[PDB]
Amino acid sequence: TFGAISASIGDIIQRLDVLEQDAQIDRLINGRLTTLNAFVAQQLVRSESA
Amino acid sequence: ASQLGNCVEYSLYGVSGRGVFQNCTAVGVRQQRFVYDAYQNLVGYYSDD
Numbered sequence: 001t002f003g004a005i006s007a008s009i010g011d012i013i014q015r016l017d018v019l020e021q022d023a024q025i026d027r028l029i030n031g032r033l034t035t036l037n038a039f040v041a042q043q044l045v046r047s048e049s050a
Numbered sequence: 051a052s053q054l055g056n057c058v059e060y061s062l063y064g065v066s067g068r069g070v071f072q073n074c075t076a077v078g079v080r081q082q083r084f085v086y087d088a089y090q091n092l093v094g095y096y097s098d099d
Contacts, residue, residue, distance in 0.1 A: 001090045008067070014066060
């Protein structure tokens with residue numbers, strides 16, 4: 001539950017219609033990409049130290 | 051729409067998710083249908099019938 005409305009995928013169909021589910025899924029995508037970028041950077045740090 | 055297939059996918063009374071079900075042990079109060087585990091999701095039971 002990273003974003004505001006994030007039930008696995010933001011309101012897939014059953015919680016919202018298309019034109020705004022686009023926006024909420026987009027928020028969730030952006031946040032989940034940021035998390036994955038952070039994960040890669042920290043893996044690089046530990047790999048250098050190792 | 052009954053527990054004939056313990057295959058992937060299902061819809062609970064309050065939530066809808068894809069999952070594989072089995073008749074397991076006896077954990078849970080049995081007073082509430084959905085039991086969770088320390089996070090968002092439910093390793094909880096169908097609690098059907």
